[PDB]
Amino acid sequence: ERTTGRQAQISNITAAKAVADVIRTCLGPKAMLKMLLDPMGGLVLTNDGHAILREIDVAHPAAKSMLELSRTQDEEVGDGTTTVIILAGEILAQCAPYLIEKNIHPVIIIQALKKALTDALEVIKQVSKPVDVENDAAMKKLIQASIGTKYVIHWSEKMCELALDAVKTVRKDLGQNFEIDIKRYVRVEKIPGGDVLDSRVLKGVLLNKDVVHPKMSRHIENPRVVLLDCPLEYKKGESQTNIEIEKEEDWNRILQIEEEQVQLMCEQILAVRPTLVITEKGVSDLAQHYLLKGGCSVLRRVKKSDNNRIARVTGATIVNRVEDLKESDVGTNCGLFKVEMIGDEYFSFLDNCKACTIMLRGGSKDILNEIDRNLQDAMAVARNVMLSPSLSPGGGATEMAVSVKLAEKAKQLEGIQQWPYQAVADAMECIPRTLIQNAGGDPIRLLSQLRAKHAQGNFTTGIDGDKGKIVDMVSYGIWEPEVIKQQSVKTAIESACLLLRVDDIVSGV
Amino acid sequence: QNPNAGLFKQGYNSYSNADGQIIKSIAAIRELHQMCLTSMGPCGRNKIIVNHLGKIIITNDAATMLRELDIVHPAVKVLVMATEQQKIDMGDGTNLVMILAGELLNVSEKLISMGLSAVEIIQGYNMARKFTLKELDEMVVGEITDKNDKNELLKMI
Amino acid sequence: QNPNAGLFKQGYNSYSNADGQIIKSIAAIRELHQMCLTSMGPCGRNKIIVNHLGKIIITNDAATMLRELDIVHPAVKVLVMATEQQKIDMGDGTNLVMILAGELLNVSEKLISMGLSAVEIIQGYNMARKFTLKELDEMVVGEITDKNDKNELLKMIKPVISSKKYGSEDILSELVSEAVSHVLPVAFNVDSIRVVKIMGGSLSNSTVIKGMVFNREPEGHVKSLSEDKKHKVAVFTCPLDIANTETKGTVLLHNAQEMLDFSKGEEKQIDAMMKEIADMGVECIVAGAGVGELALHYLNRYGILVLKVPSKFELRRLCRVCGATPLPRLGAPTPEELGLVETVKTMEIGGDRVTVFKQEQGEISRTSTIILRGATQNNLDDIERAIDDGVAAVKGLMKPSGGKLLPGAGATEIELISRITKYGERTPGLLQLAIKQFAVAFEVVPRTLAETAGLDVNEVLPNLYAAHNDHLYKGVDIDDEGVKDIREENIYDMLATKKFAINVATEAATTVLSIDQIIMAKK
Amino acid sequence: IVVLKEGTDASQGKGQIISNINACVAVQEALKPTLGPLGSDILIVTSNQKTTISNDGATILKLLDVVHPAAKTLVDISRAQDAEVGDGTTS
Amino acid sequence: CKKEDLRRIARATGATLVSSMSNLEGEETFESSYLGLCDEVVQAKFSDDECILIKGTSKHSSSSIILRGANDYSLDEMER
Amino acid sequence: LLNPKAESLRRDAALKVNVTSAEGLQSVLETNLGPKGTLKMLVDGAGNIKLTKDGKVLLTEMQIQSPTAVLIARAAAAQDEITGDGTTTVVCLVGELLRQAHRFIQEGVHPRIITDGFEIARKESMKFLDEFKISKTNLSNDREFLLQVARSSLLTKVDADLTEVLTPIVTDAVLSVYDAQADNLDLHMVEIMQMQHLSPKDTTFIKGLVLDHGGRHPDMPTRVKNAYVLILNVSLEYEKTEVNSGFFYSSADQRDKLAASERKFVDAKLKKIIDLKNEVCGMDPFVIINQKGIDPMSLDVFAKHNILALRRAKRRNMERLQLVTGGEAQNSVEDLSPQILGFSGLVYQETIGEEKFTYVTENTDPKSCTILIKGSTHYALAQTKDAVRDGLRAVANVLKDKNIIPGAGAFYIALSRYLRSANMNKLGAKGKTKTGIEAFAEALLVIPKTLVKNSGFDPLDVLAMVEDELDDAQDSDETRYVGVDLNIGDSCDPTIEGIWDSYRVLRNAITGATGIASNLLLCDELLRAGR
Ligand SMILES: Nc1ncnc2c1ncn2[C@@H]1O[C@H](COP(=O)(O)OP(=O)(O)O)[C@@H](O)[C@H]1O
Ligand SMILES: Nc1ncnc2c1ncn2[C@@H]1O[C@H](COP(=O)(O)OP(=O)(O)O)[C@@H](O)[C@H]1O
Ligand SMILES: Nc1ncnc2c1ncn2[C@@H]1O[C@H](COP(=O)(O)OP(=O)(O)O)[C@@H](O)[C@H]1O
Ligand code: BEF
Ligand code: BEF
Ligand code: BEF
Ligand code: BEF
Ligand code: BEF
Ligand SMILES: [Mg+2]
Ligand SMILES: [Mg+2]
Ligand SMILES: [Mg+2]
């Protein structure tokens, strides 16, 4: 029913702490795969944090808040998902003692944490170095960084390629910020089989819809594309259109009219001399015929999302009513119209030998979803940099810097206001630690050394994954988008600040 | 759907420590600790424990509360045991055995967090304990003259 | 206490053959075998199967019993399948496919016992089978001259009718050979022999008409036509009435004139349509489609005998009786489309009125009807099952030299025993075993005929054997002393039938041995 | 998955002390009328079925059963009063 | 659109909530007579979401706040 | 830690399970591997008997509940859905792979080291294949080689004698649709009409196209010998007003006048065709097929002029027939030219009691055949098709990929050995990562062993022989392909026996099984949350 007092507080903290506990063995280069079972049927074999926590229903309110943190974070940057959860926990946990043990009110611990966040954020931008968003080589060895710790690493280079080759493709600066809608303009397409490398980033689209009529062009050299909303069949009246006939030879009259309007429609289209007509709706058998000899291949039923991406790699602006069909609505700038038959399943291409279609190949419909998600992380950190050319010391280095500059300051602040501040510092340290642990090396040992080396000797010094020894980032490098280090710490400290505002929990609508 | 493996015994519950068990236990202890943490001292409070046969009981003492309760957590029963040692083998100090035994395990997880081994924390604790008994033998200020003189007794009781 | 391993699917039942499964199956088959082993032969018995919807059925035939039962054993369903091949693709020999397919698998375990491989027994059985079809092509004694001469037909259908309905074996086969000739031209379709039946008297009253009989009545006062040769007839796909419009079609009226006039207006318009056809000489129009009210009224005046026959499968086999042609619309009955009927009257059979459609010479018919009379509906049905059995065997003697024929009464079978074994200890290797077994198998056809005849099989069998080693006519004396002679009664199973059977039984029996594991699921 | 008491209620907090007070108040307000020269009287028909009528506050508070730990002390101090003295039990 | 916004989007660009082009007996949205003057109409994004902004206007004076937090749980309350 | 409900095998228990299951599924399909496999007969909850020996069949035909058994099944189906062959091999490969790996996990080696090894080995395996393969000239017309591919991928599911019956029927089909001079082919143009009656040995190869829907009218052509063929697709039956309509006669016979008025729209478009069968062969030297319908009255018109009219045809037959005859797929009848009909020689409608069966025999430019599968029952008719498909997509693959691989597990026993002595003096690997490639190597020996395990001769022994008869021609130099002879128990030359594994299969089998296994091994917790 009800639970006021530290009772509340505790269960919240423990709850939140437990959330972390699950995916903590998923943060690191040697991170394991949490094969989860969804209710609907299938499975999820991913190790990408947010993709795990999504597939786990929780009860305790805090555990629900803690769980959605991984989502809002997966919405800002594509990466840094697992990290925010672990941090968001350790913060609450590291407050636990001064929260009750040292009887500090939640207002005070909040007043400090909100303060320690800003200072902490400084130390992030302070250690961050900028980068050439255009230097293909830098972007690659940047995207590569956030491809490690995932099944997609055995082709790491191959991945950053398909990543950049797609981030830049749908990009479109615009200024009067840079707009990169990976979502609506980079439709992926996972096709079972082949090899990983056998996957490319076609600059166009790929529909499996075949051709409306047999004897129709399998591939127009340079096709003239015409995209339209409206269907291709005899329309009807949006009023009480009811016909009364007693005039004998009138049946034939009307029944004919239908053929007649389908004709007109074919005309208006055929007019601008098209070779490829792709409509979102249907295609009357009649209309097929008049578009056959009219000289063009037809494609019926294609999703809006599928269509509007075509209209960016054909230029062919989509148009509804045909009696208004302009000639500006061309089909210029569009290579071939291949129709490769991929294992008993016909496809259609529209490459040009603004929106690309990443086509992945692996070894199962299952294994592909691993790739797709892994790729998304790549293609997202690429976008981040595109809109914030700043990077942060990976290997948990940044995380340790903030640990010290804060630890130092806290110790030199004096007042009850110090303890909560001190905790944010002590908290931060958990990431290089989770890393060192999931590496196998001795946490107490490596950290003391990493922390010390940090205290003076440079701040771009994190821990090396497969190794387990402290290395300098600059050295073997593994910087990550500075944006990630923003959110991870922004919302984590917020989460903590929210849950700490709770002193009572109640049940009933 | 989900399978299940390596089972051939009967229907038990094995809490492997490699599953963050030490802390699950610190929790259970942490709970009964708060009960004793407010019973100690003159400023301590009482608790009314109502018997499993239905009898009222009110006591500041710790070894008694614990006795009258239906403890069940194995890691907790252990500390309730120590509260027995104290009541039998000393009659007094029953409350302080709890508060420390618990507080020890509390500031104990802080270490387990870093990475300190179980066995390392044990050793360090014993090393610190034996060392702690030494000082007490010399931190000793006065000593009753064993006078046993009635008035000398009232200074102790 | 006992554990359980290697399970991750759902709750099935896997019968691995390495668990003596082949035999578990031989068992299941062995059970339904005994049911068919006493239905074959004239000395066969019937079984009353009571439907899963509750209907009585009594039949000597095997493919029918099995059909009406709720078989479930996978290894058994396989042999019930072969009994389907036989009934569809031959109509006859359905019973012999079972008895052999089973007996094959029976003398099959004897081999599996020794150690003979599955695949070895298969191979040896096929080797023995192909070899068995060869001899049959030459073990063939006579062959009907394809004469198709009515009397020649009765020599064939008679042995098929006995051992299905033995007793009226002739009264029957005669009764059908007479229905087939009426449709067989002068330099075959099984459908052209529609069969009707009605409770009353016994079979002695059964008949053969040169056209079908119908139950419903002539519709108009036109009761029954005349007894003077020729009657012009017109068939219709369309219904006799003012057609309508598939899209609505409602009568509208703006002025009273329209009305007052529409009334009698359509009145005579119907007369019009009727009139004009009645004129072309027609006098009997069979209405496969509905018949309007006013419509029949006028026709009533023109003595036009009507006959609603919605049965599009009956109407079509009807035209092939008179000669007429079904007319989709109404109004242009070309003197060519029309047909001629000798008789189209109404006779009471067994108490109830029925309309007929025969001919007494002129205008031959290509669809005759066998009107069976009986008292027990049950029995009367198993008869129509025999009429089909014969017809099926006749349509089979056609075009590709179906006349060929070998000794019945198992006489052929006994010869086949030795003849297949000839190949037996003649083929080298261990296959020699299975090939010899395949031969023993053929002892079921004789033995059961004797067993069903109350004859001590241990006597008829050796007798019939030594009597087979010029004279391979000696079969089983259904009725006595030792064996009897096939020739002594003009009785024999034609080749086309008994051969196709042996091939289906060998497939069935072989696929059953190829399965070396089974998996089921909850139902 | 582990536990520490087997489903056995136990309240604490500052409210806990207030609950107990009010609890006692009840058992208290109960006898308030049986006070003074012109004092009201009670009629208790215990689950026993024995019907009684009295003013000895002790006798009333003895027939009320009462199980609340806190509020049950008011039953004790009322009994002692009818011992070391013999009167005033109501008060 | 949210009619509760248009009512305020219009008082803010001085425009007119066109119920139906008529006036006396004709048909027109009346060129700039009913229209509103705004400085710039842009569709800003906000991670996942992406909404429209009518910032800067003739007679707007108006404002509108947009909270950003850790999640909906805190966010509802921030505004709350 | 947790929240109520939701179970989860963790630590090495989760891996224990994963491998457990895999090993299991493996053993259950090992039986139907190799020509010397096992024919199971499984029946569903309705009593539909069905025979098989094709891993895929048995696999998608069962209800599996083991999560690991699915990820392995799905990845195996995804293989028959691309290479069309080797669904069985891949389940063994991911099984045996996990066993071989679990051995080094069980000794301590972190799984990430055995997965690293796998990838390394995988590449080296796929390199070795490209060096192992046998580029076969694009030169088709080598029906001899292809008939060995037909039998190769057929004995894997056929009644032996029936292998010889289908071996040609498949090859000729693939060829018949394949377009010589490199180019390509779409198997969809090989109709697979199947009909009951007469055993599956009686099945036949049609160079044309066989269909069901015959001319449904009495006075129709029982057999149109030598004639044109019209590819029709416009509704030749009664129709209705696309907008709500209705008749309203006020006059007695006005009714009638309106009666024919409805049908007249038919004949309008129906005449445009009937005069075409006049305008061409209007004096005898003919048949329309039509995807849509043909009502009664219309069938008369066609039956009147002796025009075999078929209705409701398989819509993909538009394209198939447009190759069997040449004539354009005539959608509308308006712009209908007499110079666009197709041509077929004997086009006869074999009626099989109520069942109609029109054939399109004698063609000039076939380019689209029809494999008519015959068969007494449904269970056989089923399996026979599942054998043709798994052996047709098998030949057409020999063409697409102009390479082939010696069977009898030659490639496996090879790669196996190679990797062994490779890293011994390669060190082109990693540190303790040698374990994983060592496993992968030993793993591969699944196919050869299992291949004989099914035959009979002891796996361990016969495989030992190949390992000997092999290096024999290595210590004497020269290349000699070696495989397991599943009849004797000795080794033999796959190429000489006529035993071939399609290249694209092996390329998508190894990269596949590793993808699963290697991703399974990195699994450390099986959740089950989210009601
Ligand atoms: N190559 C590596 N070596 C050491 N640390 C790494 C390496 N790769 C990722 N990191 C660090 O680990 C974290 C990223 O791990 P990851 O498993 O990808 O979690 P997320 O889902 O948040 O990306 C960051 O702190 C990053 O600095
Ligand atoms: N008149 C008869 N005398 C001896 N055998 C006969 C006679 N008539 C038919 N048979 C035997 O009937 C056997 C077949 O049994 P039957 O009951 O007719 O089943 P089916 O004909 O369906 O196989 C044949 O082997 C044939 O020899
Ligand atoms: N007669 C043979 N002798 C040796 N190997 C053969 C023989 N015929 C085909 N095989 C083997 O059959 C194996 C494939 O087994 P199969 O039962 O076809 O399953 P799938 O093809 O579905 O994996 C191939 O690896 C091939 O080497
Ligand atoms: F592992 Be994270 F999501 F890239
Ligand atoms: F509670 Be103690 F024993 F003083
Ligand atoms: F029973 Be059989 F068909 F004569
Ligand atoms: F009620 Be009291 F004891 F006077
Ligand atoms: F058995 Be496999 F699919 F060839
Ligand atoms: Mg990442
Ligand atoms: Mg018979
Ligand atoms: Mg195969």
PDB file of C-alpha atoms in Angstrom, chain C residues 305-442:
ATOM      1  CA  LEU C 305     -44.908 -31.884 -70.984  1.00  0.00           C
ATOM      2  CA  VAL C 306     -42.436 -30.150 -68.653  1.00  0.00           C
ATOM      3  CA  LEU C 307     -39.811 -31.738 -66.331  1.00  0.00           C
ATOM      4  CA  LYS C 308     -37.793 -29.593 -63.921  1.00  0.00           C
ATOM      5  CA  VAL C 309     -34.386 -31.345 -63.752  1.00  0.00           C
ATOM      6  CA  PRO C 310     -32.027 -28.965 -61.900  1.00  0.00           C
ATOM      7  CA  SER C 311     -29.443 -31.724 -61.821  1.00  0.00           C
ATOM      8  CA  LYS C 312     -26.980 -30.310 -64.378  1.00  0.00           C
ATOM      9  CA  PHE C 313     -25.249 -33.709 -64.264  1.00  0.00           C
ATOM     10  CA  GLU C 314     -28.560 -35.472 -64.927  1.00  0.00           C
ATOM     11  CA  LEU C 315     -29.769 -33.058 -67.636  1.00  0.00           C
ATOM     12  CA  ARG C 316     -26.527 -33.538 -69.528  1.00  0.00           C
ATOM     13  CA  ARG C 317     -26.704 -37.346 -69.323  1.00  0.00           C
ATOM     14  CA  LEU C 318     -30.371 -36.954 -70.370  1.00  0.00           C
ATOM     15  CA  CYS C 319     -29.722 -35.216 -73.660  1.00  0.00           C
ATOM     16  CA  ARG C 320     -27.467 -38.120 -74.541  1.00  0.00           C
ATOM     17  CA  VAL C 321     -30.580 -40.330 -74.287  1.00  0.00           C
ATOM     18  CA  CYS C 322     -32.898 -38.535 -76.730  1.00  0.00           C
ATOM     19  CA  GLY C 323     -30.432 -36.607 -78.860  1.00  0.00           C
ATOM     20  CA  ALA C 324     -31.464 -33.051 -77.998  1.00  0.00           C
ATOM     21  CA  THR C 325     -29.112 -30.234 -77.044  1.00  0.00           C
ATOM     22  CA  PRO C 326     -29.151 -27.924 -73.999  1.00  0.00           C
ATOM     23  CA  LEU C 327     -30.141 -24.398 -75.043  1.00  0.00           C
ATOM     24  CA  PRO C 328     -28.624 -21.517 -72.936  1.00  0.00           C
ATOM     25  CA  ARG C 329     -31.200 -18.859 -73.902  1.00  0.00           C
ATOM     26  CA  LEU C 330     -34.845 -19.339 -75.002  1.00  0.00           C
ATOM     27  CA  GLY C 331     -36.522 -18.855 -78.376  1.00  0.00           C
ATOM     28  CA  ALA C 332     -34.300 -20.148 -81.180  1.00  0.00           C
ATOM     29  CA  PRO C 333     -34.812 -23.918 -80.849  1.00  0.00           C
ATOM     30  CA  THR C 334     -33.215 -24.868 -84.203  1.00  0.00           C
ATOM     31  CA  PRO C 335     -34.744 -28.071 -85.569  1.00  0.00           C
ATOM     32  CA  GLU C 336     -31.200 -29.331 -85.107  1.00  0.00           C
ATOM     33  CA  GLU C 337     -30.939 -28.578 -81.342  1.00  0.00           C
ATOM     34  CA  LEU C 338     -34.038 -30.667 -80.679  1.00  0.00           C
ATOM     35  CA  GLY C 339     -34.024 -34.370 -79.854  1.00  0.00           C
ATOM     36  CA  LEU C 340     -36.308 -37.364 -80.096  1.00  0.00           C
ATOM     37  CA  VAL C 341     -37.779 -39.529 -77.337  1.00  0.00           C
ATOM     38  CA  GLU C 342     -39.760 -42.719 -77.819  1.00  0.00           C
ATOM     39  CA  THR C 343     -41.342 -42.715 -74.322  1.00  0.00           C
ATOM     40  CA  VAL C 344     -41.791 -39.945 -71.710  1.00  0.00           C
ATOM     41  CA  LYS C 345     -44.627 -41.111 -69.428  1.00  0.00           C
ATOM     42  CA  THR C 346     -45.218 -41.484 -65.676  1.00  0.00           C
ATOM     43  CA  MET C 347     -45.078 -44.945 -64.040  1.00  0.00           C
ATOM     44  CA  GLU C 348     -45.653 -45.819 -60.375  1.00  0.00           C
ATOM     45  CA  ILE C 349     -42.799 -47.942 -59.057  1.00  0.00           C
ATOM     46  CA  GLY C 350     -43.168 -49.478 -55.607  1.00  0.00           C
ATOM     47  CA  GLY C 351     -46.149 -47.239 -54.976  1.00  0.00           C
ATOM     48  CA  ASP C 352     -44.768 -43.784 -55.878  1.00  0.00           C
ATOM     49  CA  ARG C 353     -45.011 -41.834 -59.164  1.00  0.00           C
ATOM     50  CA  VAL C 354     -41.940 -41.293 -61.350  1.00  0.00           C
ATOM     51  CA  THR C 355     -41.399 -39.851 -64.809  1.00  0.00           C
ATOM     52  CA  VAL C 356     -39.502 -41.937 -67.456  1.00  0.00           C
ATOM     53  CA  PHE C 357     -37.379 -41.106 -70.565  1.00  0.00           C
ATOM     54  CA  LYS C 358     -36.685 -44.244 -72.629  1.00  0.00           C
ATOM     55  CA  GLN C 359     -36.804 -45.525 -76.203  1.00  0.00           C
ATOM     56  CA  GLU C 360     -37.913 -48.899 -77.691  1.00  0.00           C
ATOM     57  CA  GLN C 361     -35.674 -48.889 -80.821  1.00  0.00           C
ATOM     58  CA  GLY C 362     -35.705 -45.670 -82.851  1.00  0.00           C
ATOM     59  CA  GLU C 363     -33.316 -42.953 -81.670  1.00  0.00           C
ATOM     60  CA  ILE C 364     -30.682 -44.925 -79.795  1.00  0.00           C
ATOM     61  CA  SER C 365     -29.531 -43.703 -76.342  1.00  0.00           C
ATOM     62  CA  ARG C 366     -26.017 -43.071 -74.987  1.00  0.00           C
ATOM     63  CA  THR C 367     -27.157 -43.137 -71.331  1.00  0.00           C
ATOM     64  CA  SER C 368     -29.089 -46.110 -69.977  1.00  0.00           C
ATOM     65  CA  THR C 369     -30.438 -46.713 -66.456  1.00  0.00           C
ATOM     66  CA  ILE C 370     -30.415 -49.866 -64.327  1.00  0.00           C
ATOM     67  CA  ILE C 371     -33.496 -49.833 -62.109  1.00  0.00           C
ATOM     68  CA  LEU C 372     -32.751 -52.146 -59.156  1.00  0.00           C
ATOM     69  CA  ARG C 373     -35.568 -53.406 -57.029  1.00  0.00           C
ATOM     70  CA  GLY C 374     -34.912 -54.735 -53.545  1.00  0.00           C
ATOM     71  CA  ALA C 375     -36.359 -54.882 -50.027  1.00  0.00           C
ATOM     72  CA  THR C 376     -33.445 -54.025 -47.780  1.00  0.00           C
ATOM     73  CA  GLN C 377     -32.067 -50.594 -48.659  1.00  0.00           C
ATOM     74  CA  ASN C 378     -28.732 -51.626 -47.120  1.00  0.00           C
ATOM     75  CA  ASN C 379     -28.100 -54.604 -49.378  1.00  0.00           C
ATOM     76  CA  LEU C 380     -29.505 -52.689 -52.339  1.00  0.00           C
ATOM     77  CA  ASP C 381     -26.642 -50.272 -51.943  1.00  0.00           C
ATOM     78  CA  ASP C 382     -23.857 -52.872 -51.887  1.00  0.00           C
ATOM     79  CA  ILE C 383     -25.352 -53.992 -55.182  1.00  0.00           C
ATOM     80  CA  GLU C 384     -24.884 -50.579 -56.822  1.00  0.00           C
ATOM     81  CA  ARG C 385     -21.298 -51.026 -55.582  1.00  0.00           C
ATOM     82  CA  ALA C 386     -21.030 -54.209 -57.582  1.00  0.00           C
ATOM     83  CA  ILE C 387     -22.604 -52.629 -60.667  1.00  0.00           C
ATOM     84  CA  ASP C 388     -19.823 -50.081 -60.491  1.00  0.00           C
ATOM     85  CA  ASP C 389     -17.152 -52.783 -59.961  1.00  0.00           C
ATOM     86  CA  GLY C 390     -18.142 -54.465 -63.203  1.00  0.00           C
ATOM     87  CA  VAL C 391     -18.523 -51.289 -65.246  1.00  0.00           C
ATOM     88  CA  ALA C 392     -15.143 -50.130 -64.017  1.00  0.00           C
ATOM     89  CA  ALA C 393     -13.596 -53.389 -65.275  1.00  0.00           C
ATOM     90  CA  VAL C 394     -15.284 -53.028 -68.682  1.00  0.00           C
ATOM     91  CA  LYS C 395     -14.164 -49.452 -69.312  1.00  0.00           C
ATOM     92  CA  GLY C 396     -10.781 -50.935 -68.569  1.00  0.00           C
ATOM     93  CA  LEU C 397     -10.853 -53.635 -71.253  1.00  0.00           C
ATOM     94  CA  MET C 398     -10.947 -50.823 -73.794  1.00  0.00           C
ATOM     95  CA  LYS C 399      -8.505 -49.387 -76.310  1.00  0.00           C
ATOM     96  CA  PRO C 400      -5.101 -50.528 -75.116  1.00  0.00           C
ATOM     97  CA  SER C 401      -5.801 -54.299 -75.384  1.00  0.00           C
ATOM     98  CA  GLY C 402      -7.595 -54.690 -72.077  1.00  0.00           C
ATOM     99  CA  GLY C 403      -9.097 -58.014 -73.080  1.00  0.00           C
ATOM    100  CA  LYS C 404      -6.056 -59.991 -71.894  1.00  0.00           C
ATOM    101  CA  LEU C 405      -6.934 -62.454 -69.135  1.00  0.00           C
ATOM    102  CA  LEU C 406      -5.511 -65.096 -66.736  1.00  0.00           C
ATOM    103  CA  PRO C 407      -7.024 -67.879 -64.503  1.00  0.00           C
ATOM    104  CA  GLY C 408      -9.095 -66.686 -61.546  1.00  0.00           C
ATOM    105  CA  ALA C 409      -9.740 -68.721 -58.375  1.00  0.00           C
ATOM    106  CA  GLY C 410      -6.130 -68.123 -57.432  1.00  0.00           C
ATOM    107  CA  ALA C 411      -5.094 -70.709 -60.027  1.00  0.00           C
ATOM    108  CA  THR C 412      -2.940 -67.924 -61.473  1.00  0.00           C
ATOM    109  CA  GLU C 413      -1.648 -67.150 -58.021  1.00  0.00           C
ATOM    110  CA  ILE C 414      -0.491 -70.718 -57.338  1.00  0.00           C
ATOM    111  CA  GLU C 415       1.430 -70.744 -60.634  1.00  0.00           C
ATOM    112  CA  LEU C 416       2.851 -67.357 -59.666  1.00  0.00           C
ATOM    113  CA  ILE C 417       4.238 -68.828 -56.458  1.00  0.00           C
ATOM    114  CA  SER C 418       6.519 -71.293 -58.239  1.00  0.00           C
ATOM    115  CA  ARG C 419       7.218 -68.907 -61.113  1.00  0.00           C
ATOM    116  CA  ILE C 420       8.421 -66.090 -58.797  1.00  0.00           C
ATOM    117  CA  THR C 421      10.494 -68.550 -56.773  1.00  0.00           C
ATOM    118  CA  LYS C 422      11.990 -69.705 -60.074  1.00  0.00           C
ATOM    119  CA  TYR C 423      13.573 -66.273 -60.043  1.00  0.00           C
ATOM    120  CA  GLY C 424      14.193 -66.809 -56.353  1.00  0.00           C
ATOM    121  CA  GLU C 425      16.908 -69.437 -55.946  1.00  0.00           C
ATOM    122  CA  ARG C 426      18.052 -68.328 -59.408  1.00  0.00           C
ATOM    123  CA  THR C 427      19.209 -64.842 -58.427  1.00  0.00           C
ATOM    124  CA  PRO C 428      22.519 -64.985 -56.545  1.00  0.00           C
ATOM    125  CA  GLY C 429      23.209 -63.284 -53.264  1.00  0.00           C
ATOM    126  CA  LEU C 430      21.094 -62.860 -50.175  1.00  0.00           C
ATOM    127  CA  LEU C 431      18.352 -61.079 -52.183  1.00  0.00           C
ATOM    128  CA  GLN C 432      17.336 -64.630 -53.003  1.00  0.00           C
ATOM    129  CA  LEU C 433      15.598 -64.714 -49.636  1.00  0.00           C
ATOM    130  CA  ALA C 434      13.326 -61.720 -50.054  1.00  0.00           C
ATOM    131  CA  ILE C 435      12.567 -62.719 -53.621  1.00  0.00           C
ATOM    132  CA  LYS C 436      11.456 -66.129 -52.375  1.00  0.00           C
ATOM    133  CA  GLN C 437       9.365 -64.541 -49.644  1.00  0.00           C
ATOM    134  CA  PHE C 438       7.723 -62.208 -52.119  1.00  0.00           C
ATOM    135  CA  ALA C 439       6.574 -65.438 -53.728  1.00  0.00           C
ATOM    136  CA  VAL C 440       5.189 -67.078 -50.571  1.00  0.00           C
ATOM    137  CA  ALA C 441       3.188 -63.904 -50.162  1.00  0.00           C
ATOM    138  CA  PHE C 442       1.037 -64.855 -53.140  1.00  0.00           C
TER     139      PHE C 442
END
